[PDB]
Design an enzyme around this catalytic site. Structure first.
Site, PDB file in Angstrom:
ATOM      1  N   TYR A  89      17.912   8.015  27.803  1.00 42.00           N
ATOM      2  CA  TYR A  89      17.401   6.743  27.309  1.00 42.00           C
ATOM      3  C   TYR A  89      17.721   5.580  28.239  1.00 42.00           C
ATOM      4  CZ  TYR A  89      16.356   9.155  22.906  1.00 42.00           C
ATOM      5  OH  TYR A  89      15.858  10.001  21.922  1.00 42.00           O
ATOM      6  N   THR A  92      14.696   5.770  30.667  1.00 39.17           N
ATOM      7  CA  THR A  92      13.529   5.161  30.062  1.00 39.17           C
ATOM      8  C   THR A  92      13.611   3.642  30.052  1.00 39.17           C
ATOM      9  OG1 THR A  92      14.544   5.654  27.909  1.00 39.17           O
ATOM     10  CG2 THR A  92      12.781   7.113  28.659  1.00 39.17           C
ATOM     11  N   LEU A  93      14.793   3.102  29.786  1.00 36.08           N
ATOM     12  CA  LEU A  93      14.955   1.651  29.756  1.00 36.08           C
ATOM     13  C   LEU A  93      14.757   1.078  31.144  1.00 36.08           C
ATOM     14  CD1 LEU A  93      15.576  -0.905  28.266  1.00 36.08           C
ATOM     15  CD2 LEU A  93      18.021  -0.466  28.557  1.00 36.08           C
ATOM     16  N   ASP A  96      11.180   0.816  31.996  1.00 36.77           N
ATOM     17  CA  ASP A  96      10.564  -0.237  31.216  1.00 36.77           C
ATOM     18  C   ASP A  96      10.526  -1.547  31.976  1.00 36.77           C
ATOM     19  OD1 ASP A  96       9.635  -2.015  29.224  1.00 36.77           O
ATOM     20  OD2 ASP A  96      10.623  -0.868  27.641  1.00 36.77           O
ATOM     21  N   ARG A 178       2.246   0.398  20.790  1.00 38.59           N
ATOM     22  CA  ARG A 178       3.607   0.451  20.296  1.00 38.59           C
ATOM     23  C   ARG A 178       4.085   1.894  20.191  1.00 38.59           C
ATOM     24  NH1 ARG A 178       8.565  -0.602  20.871  1.00 38.59           N
ATOM     25  NH2 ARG A 178       9.656  -1.546  19.074  1.00 38.59           N
ATOM     26  N   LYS A 228      14.956 -13.169  19.380  1.00 40.40           N
ATOM     27  CA  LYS A 228      15.152 -13.247  20.818  1.00 40.40           C
ATOM     28  C   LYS A 228      13.857 -13.362  21.641  1.00 40.40           C
ATOM     29  CE  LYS A 228      15.620  -9.744  24.317  1.00 40.40           C
ATOM     30  NZ  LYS A 228      15.462  -8.272  24.472  1.00 40.40           N
ATOM     31  N   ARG A 300      22.390  -8.830  23.627  1.00 41.22           N
ATOM     32  CA  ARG A 300      20.998  -8.850  24.069  1.00 41.22           C
ATOM     33  C   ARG A 300      20.079  -9.441  22.998  1.00 41.22           C
ATOM     34  NH1 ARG A 300      20.817  -5.846  26.743  1.00 41.22           N
ATOM     35  NH2 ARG A 300      19.438  -4.945  28.351  1.00 41.22           N
ATOM     36  N   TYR A 301      20.375  -9.152  21.731  1.00 38.12           N
ATOM     37  CA  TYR A 301      19.551  -9.634  20.622  1.00 38.12           C
ATOM     38  C   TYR A 301      19.952 -10.998  20.083  1.00 38.12           C
ATOM     39  CZ  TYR A 301      17.928  -4.935  21.176  1.00 38.12           C
ATOM     40  OH  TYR A 301      17.416  -3.789  21.737  1.00 38.12           O
TER      41      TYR A 301
END
Lengths: 350, 354
Positions: A89, A92-93, A96, A178, A228, A300-301
């Site tokens: 993951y 994948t990030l 992105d 999405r 955010k 981050r959020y």
């Protein structure tokens, strides 16, 4: 700046039965460091350093966000599984945030795949080479789901480079995109290590979990990330923003749609699995709670900003909200210095 | 119910054909026959090869019938692509149709799926061995992006069949299951992307319209197929699962409410397909329109769907919907009704034996 956020957020946490668990801070720290440590050594290898074009600071930050996400949401899987899933993951990030056009490196994708030659796109070269470390934890069915979702994700990123929110009137576009980049089936299937669950014995519950968890997971992420976003916004193409552009509705109506889907998804998640195999319900519940905890705790959020502007407030929400927020912090608030070390760059240089 | 909602069915069908602007085209019967035979002929020779005959466990008569249904579907819906492309796509979609004849648990042949793929060793599941070996003939017609869509949708389809082996309509309360499964086995992105041969369209210049077409055509194509199939599957105690039947089981609603849902989605999808593409690149709108009309024509003309029966039951009824339906049906028949003896020969079995 809407405050409706807290109403839905509280309803969300209630709907999913947000509550404390036997997962201690000591245990989270053990997992966090283990997961981080294996991943960090992995990305620090010369081959990985060479093919993965990422700013070191961003790689470092992405790894820490991901390790947290995994350790807090895949609470029931082995340490090793958390580690390997964290590597996947994180890959994948990292993709992105890439801006490198895929077209030229995908011209011979299938023929190289069929022939067993290394993929031209460096990301594929690394991810496919590493994949077995993730797949060894699962049966053939769950594995296929991970493989498909990652392949979908790759196409998702390709489409996102166009920064396209869909043609006005193209109502099917938003969710199409999405799901494309949501890793819904990847997440949903990685919740069932063959070491803890029998893919064949629980085929029906797992398939159902994948189908339902796909939407809950992405919608919940969209809801948490909304704060955010209209705030500091390089012109993005979020699910909500695309609803606006494609369905030709107001940012409010769009956000209302998202919340209705998110709450209904939660309600149904409970209705279906409460009375099913207890081990299943536990994994599902821990993922939901962990996933929310992670969103509330990761800077981050910036949900923390919401906390302050509401503590010295008194209502049926802002109150319940902080009660939850505070709960999260008690187990989720952990200084990175307690687990995320040494930095990837340091291991890479050595 | 136990009685088929003929009125309701007729209405939506007419609305459907109107919303999509169903009308005659420059595609003549002579041209259809040319394409039908060409597509069929190449596919038949393909499935008649010994390797294909060996690994593809299918009853000859069913293979024969599946190939004929598929060739018709492709030739009538992918009206704008080359003969070769129609042929190759016919082989691919025939493979997919055939996999639904397998009851064999994919599990044991999927244990080493990824490692064999990564290593370049032939897949253990024979269907994958054939399909992946043949895939390049389909992919050569498209750019990298569209190709990826075809590859993903086919992989999705394989998982779809796996799940369908369980004959599971979803747990009551699992509202997300029905469409999750329908998209899994719909080949939506396969169809949607195969509509754009690189020889006729530029994947990069039209990236936005193609991606949009894939997203929208996915649901139109599957929902339209579910609706057209509704009549044949109505009294079929063998077909236990379908989008509508799962809506019933999962959403806990009546077969009628389920059918209502489907029709609302189908009509809205159609209306939006037009609204979005009418004023876009004319070549695009043409491919999209021809696929929709071709796809409907095919459903009306293929006996598999037995729509002829509904026609022959309202053939002479002075109601508005009924007459409109029969008019549309007659239109289809004028270009779609073709005796298999004019294009589908010799039989695959004969070429295989030779």
């Amino acid at each position: 700046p809407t405050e409706y956020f807290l109403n839905t957020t509280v309803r969300l946490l209630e709907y999913i039965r947000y509550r404390d668990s036997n997962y201690t801070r000591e245990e989270r720290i053990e997992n966090l460091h283990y997961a981080y440590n294996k991943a960090a050594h992995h990305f620090a290898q010369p081959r990985q350093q060479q093919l993965l074009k990422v700013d070191p600071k961003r790689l470092q930050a992405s790894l820490q966000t991901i390790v947290g996400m995994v350790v807090y949401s895949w609470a029931k899987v082995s340490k090793e599984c958390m580690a390997d899933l964290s590597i996947h993951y994180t890959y994948t990030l990292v993709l992105d945030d890439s801006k490198d056009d895929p077209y030229p490196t995908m011209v011979n994708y299938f023929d190289d795949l069929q022939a067993g030659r290394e993929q031209a796109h460096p990301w594929w070269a690394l991810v496919n080479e590493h994949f077995p470390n993730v797949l060894r934890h699962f049966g053939p069915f769950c594995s296929l789901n991970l493989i498909r979702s990652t392949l979908d994700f790759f196409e998702g990123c390709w489409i996102e480079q166009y920064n396209f929110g869909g043609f006005p009137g193209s109502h099917d576009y938003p969710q199409f995109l999405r799901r494309m980049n949501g890793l819904g089936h990847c997440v949903g299937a990685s919740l069932w290590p063959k070491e803890q669950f029998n893919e064949r014995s629980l085929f029906l519950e797992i398939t159902s979990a994948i189908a339902q968890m796909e939407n809950w997971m992405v919608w919940v992420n969209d809801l948490m990330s909304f704060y955010k976003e209209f705030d500091d916004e390089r012109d993005q193409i979020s699910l909500v923003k695309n609803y606006v552009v494609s369905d030709e509705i107001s940012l409010h109506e769009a956000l209302e749609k998202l919340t209705q889907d998110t709450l209904h998804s939660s309600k149904q998640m409970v209705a279906v699995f409460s009375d099913k195999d207890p081990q299943v319900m536990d994994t599902i519940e821990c993922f939901m709670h962990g996933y929310v905890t992670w969103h509330l705790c990761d800077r981050r959020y910036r949900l923390s900003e919401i906390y302050e502007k509401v503590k010295e407030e008194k209502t049926e929400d802002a109150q319940k909200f902080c009660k939850f927020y505070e709960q999260a912090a008690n187990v989720g608030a952990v200084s990175p210095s307690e687990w995320a070390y040494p930095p990837v760059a340091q291991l890479a240089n050595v």
